[PDB]
Symmetry: D2
Subunit: 363 residues, 4 copies
């Protein structure tokens, strides 16, 4: 085939630099791009009514954590509303994040849509006018974006259709981002829903990723200016087989080594419905795996970095300092974790708390 410089060296320079800053040694990502709706249940959980102000404040709470979080957070995925919201001190959220050493992020997908003829599978939308938006968001403070595609494992899923479609949508999305100076975090989120073993998930993960990487190659994407955001190869949420953090870690590292080429600046795993602690133990075990990992393996957590903070906050602004603490210890815990220097109080922190399924009540 014939080359056609999609990006000039000048453009390629910036993309790679921005990519690195986010995943620099120890650094991670706080995914707080919860849409006004997905955050509604979060706010309701503690009794706080989903109001413009309540939202702004909670976003600020995490964002105003004292300087201890600085060496912990490399980037923060923001939501459109949040991006234009300001902190009490007059300074707008992106500027706040700026001063704290982190790269600002923004979500660009418009949600999921069903695929006719499939077993309830989906694809994601958000391309129409994405270039126009990227151009604006960039000028308004963001440098990296996030687009989420979902895939279900099951009896007949994922199908070749779901795989090939999403891979292609992510490529389109990626192509647009890089044209507007924005590092695209690609998110092939294979949901851990079902009673599938570790291998089954590993198989699917190796497959979905192998498709994604061929898609980006077709659409001429600058790999060193991207970041993968996959789910860890963990057993299906209803599996009756006991697995150790070393196994999920090994299976996750193998799958990535088999599909993600070394030119990918870094893999930012997300919490597969995992608890704050577990997420950290696993991330740590991943970084301790003897297998040569050519890329930065860090985090991009929403709940794992918020759960206790949102809880402590509990609407009571008096709790502000307490809530910010639960967040910072989590940030520190994970920053250590993404280096294999995290000690979960003696090598086994979160142990299996009454495994409802494996036990005997799942027979």
């Amino acid at each position: 085939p014939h080359s056609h410089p999609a990006l000039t060296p000048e453009q390629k320079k910036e993309l790679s630099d921005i990519a690195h800053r986010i995943v620099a040694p120890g650094k991670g990502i706080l995914a707080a791009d919860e849409s006004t709706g997905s955050i509604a249940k979060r706010l309701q959980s503690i009794g706080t009514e989903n109001t413009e102000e309540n939202r702004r404040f909670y976003r600020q709470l995490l964002l105003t954590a004292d300087d201890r979080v600085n060496p912990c957070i490399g980037g923060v995925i923001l939501f459109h509303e949040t991006l234009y919201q300001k902190a009490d001190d007059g300074r707008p959220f992106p500027q706040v994040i700026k001063s704290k050493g982190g790269v600002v992020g923004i979500k660009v997908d418009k949600g999921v849509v069903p695929l006719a003829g499939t077993n309830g599978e989906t694809t994601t939308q958000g391309l129409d006018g994405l270039s126009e938006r990227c151009a604006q968001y960039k000028k308004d403070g963001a440098d990296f974006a996030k687009w989420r595609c979902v895939l279900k494992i099951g009896e007949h899923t994922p199908s070749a259709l779901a795989i090939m479609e999403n891979a292609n949508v992510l490529a389109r999305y990626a192509s647009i981002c890089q044209q507007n100076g924005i590092v695209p975090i690609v998110e092939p989120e294979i949901l851990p829903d079902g009673d599938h073993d570790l291998k089954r998930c590993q198989y699917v993960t190796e497959k979905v990723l192998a498709a994604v990487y061929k898609a980006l190659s077709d659409h001429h994407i600058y790999l060193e200016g991207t970041l993968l955001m996959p789910n860890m190869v963990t057993p299906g949420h209803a599996c009756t087989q006991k697995y150790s953090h070393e196994e999920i870690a090994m299976a996750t590292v193998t799958a990535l080594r088999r599909t993600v080429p070394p030119a990918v600046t870094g893999v930012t795993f997300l919490s597969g419905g995992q608890s704050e602690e577990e997420a950290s133990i696993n991330l740590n075990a991943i970084n301790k795996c003897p297998l040569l990992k050519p890329w930065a393996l860090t985090f991009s957590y929403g709940r794992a970095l918020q759960a206790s903070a949102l809880k402590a906050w509990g609407g009571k602004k008096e709790n502000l300092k307490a809530a910010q603490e639960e967040y910072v210890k989590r940030a520190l815990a994970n920053s250590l974790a993404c280096q294999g220097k995290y000690t979960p109080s003696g090598q086994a922190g979160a142990a299996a708390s009454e495994s409802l399924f494996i036990s005997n009540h799942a027979y």
Copy 2:
């Protein structure tokens, strides 16, 4: 692989019925879906200021044009603006069309966007919210839609990526439409620009169509509930070679016979920068080809059906009866053409166009 009913028999029926109604023996499609910009330039030529009114009036002139066009026009491709405009008699445009026998359609795509890393190649956007749009358009009288894709022929074009991205994006649109009871008109538009000969165009057309259909198959698209709207295989507008009308017909039909499956209800050719007569005679010649054509080959002309009526209405309302008549004529001419019974034979005679390329001045 395993089945998953994208469309129930009830839905399958409605789709094929609306499709055959449009391409009924003799009937054709009127394309009056010019964007406010495309119609603007058109109105400039006759000396008419581009306002919502003059557009509404122009669209009206064609719509309420005698009852003689009734057996000629099976459907009209409308524009968003026009779908909500009323005729002087306080009657909605989609209502005049239905009463006069035609099926109302609409343009849905939101235009073309550049694909990075290609030589000026493109793709088409419009998938965001297509379902919500098709559900409303459905409730408003429309029953079919149009999505145009552009594919330029050149040194290294069309490329694997442009052919694949466009093929796939068309297939997505068809899925959504059909889900909402709309019959999709697949439009893989290969531009007749360049000095490329006839055969080159016949090569790329087979290649484009072959891709397009595999994409429809993959997405579980009900072929019987669709229509193709390709250009006639013709030499580029800079070819210095003289081609007979019998040749255009043969290249076109051979290409379609080789790619389009029999189940495709009908092929509605577009004008392709051709004059009103030339379009009529080429459509006719195509229908007279000795080869077996398992689908209705008809017209879907915009310019080749409005050129004479348009210039015959330089804003002056008095030119009503006169202007509307040129339309009736072209409608009747093409109705004979889409049956192979159009008396105007030969090639030109006392008809011709800029022979500058097919002459010494192009050497």
Copy 3:
């Protein structure tokens, strides 16, 4: 892309002529190309011992049937061995065949082989050295070839790998055949084994045949100069639900008209384990189905045209006449069948030999 002619007008021409000769109105194909191991099975099934003479004679049994058979046999598929054998009169077998008005055929594949990582799926070999073998064959009076790919239905079959793999080998074999002046018969054989319903067999067929033509397109195969040899869309052999010939017919033609383009000269069906009568009644019904079929829908029968010939022969060289008459009857029956004018001398009447399963059914 650049139009690179794979064949000249001369070569295109020859293949088209040959293909049309085989599928001419009323004419079908006698598949008499069993391997020494396949024919050996059939011999002991009637108490005959496998031998070159017994094979030669038996092949001669069919090949010399009275002249009422001439108008029925458009082509005969031979095995490598028989292509080189002579008749009792001294005339080489290809000569006798050519004297009755048929085109000579030769199987050119070297059997199926396993695809690793699949669920007992296969692919086919025989590609190595094709050009040289085909050339020899073409010279030795063989104008067309056959290549069998065996696909199969199960809860996870046929898988993408199997589908695109078998499809790609077909396009390769075809490419080589036409390059040497031999019209290739694409045999995408979906096994009738299993208890899948008609809906399942039809859904599969559409996906398979879709992949096959996209592939044939990629490899630059001249469709007009190729014949398809698919299985009739019927339910699985273990399927406990009985279907009417109209349904089998409907599903057969529907799937076909949805995937096979009109440019394909013919579709020579194979009777997957059907009795002599069934094969005829179904082929007859398929030819009476109201839907528009732009290609010849004939037969390419093996046991449907040999069950009684073998049975009546019984080894006795004296029973030859009864045996030839049996063959002639089925041929004449199918010559009509492929014209939808067959004499239903069935209604549950055709030699009851064996049914299904494996328990106590050696060979």
Copy 4:
């Protein structure tokens, strides 16, 4: 997808072993797979009789070299002939190779063949009976095999077909090799022929490889049990611009990082028609490239290890001492190069490269 185990843990482990030890620290591969044809030309260049004994001797010359070479060579690719040839002591070469710590290889493809409808493109055969050959070869000591696929660079080549075709064939042989305990070496040989520049050769390389790893993936190939034998990214042999060895290295490393996943044991580069010294120098700088290389980067040279050694043989059975030193010289030189420990030597001399040209010597 659906996980159907292609290899057992035992097989996977064994393949990983065989592979890891071929590219072990400081080790490389000797290409002694010269078909009777290729080797014949090399012999004529020095004026020799192309006799089985001469071919046997010339190779015994390289195989029974002094132990200094033992640490440099991890494997030797042999032609079918040599695998069954014995050294003077009455011991087959496969054993003489195993004794010195090296692993014996074997060429299994039957050569290239043209692809109808392309611009001089080809594909490779050798799949028929490959499992049988692999099984036997595994019995004769051969632990790894080799399959060559040639890709050409031109105005419109390679084409999608060429890429997809070869990538799919390499993946076929890989699945079979691994199916018989043989570590396959996928050799995607992109020809150095042409005038294309460095950037162009790199673009193409990434594209080809990406397709090759997608194919391998679809085919369930166990990557860890395979090697990669590509050419170094270099400008066409007729290119006017001269590039620094750093540039060869840079484009080579960047290209491979972009398309070869970490899981691939190693890359064994080809001489590509370079001088013995240039091959060493280039390979040296490829290993000294500041970018992270998660895979062994060694050699798999033929003439770059045999050129001077062959010239220092002539045709008399005593120059053995001379010929051997040259082989050992080159093998030691490259052993250092594949670690970044190669002191770039000088020239100022005639050296020993290729055959005769317009340049005379006396007569």
